[PDB]
Design a protein. Structure first.
Lengths: 50, 50
């Protein structure tokens, strides 16, 4: 989307592989805050949003 | 910022009681033997509070 109206999607009821994302070398930017990207495949949350 | 004060972000093992390690070698986050690679799979370990 045009960023003033940024896309939102609820992520829930599913396992989220972050390893494919931190492995995705085509990302010109890939950054994490409050937590390490390597830790994410151990973590759990009620929801996530894209 | 006063940049003179910095902390190690990550290490392959966490400290034992008063363990000391001043090595600034590029941190390895994945399968890449770093050899000077920074920003993807490998990183500079010290971060300034600035």
């Amino acid at each position: 989307a045009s960023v003033y109206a940024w896309n939102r999607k609820r992520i829930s009821n599913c396992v989220a592989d972050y390893s494919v994302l931190y492995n995705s070398a085509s990302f010109s930017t890939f950054k994490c805050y409050g937590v390490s990207p390597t830790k994410l495949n151990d973590l759990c949350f009620t929801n996530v949003y894209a | 910022g006063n940049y003179n004060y910095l902390y190690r972000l990550f290490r392959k093992s966490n400290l034992k009681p008063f363990e000391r390690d001043i090595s600034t070698e590029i941190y390895q986050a994945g399968s890449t033997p770093c050899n000077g690679v920074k920003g993807f799979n490998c990183y500079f370990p010290l971060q300034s509070y600035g």
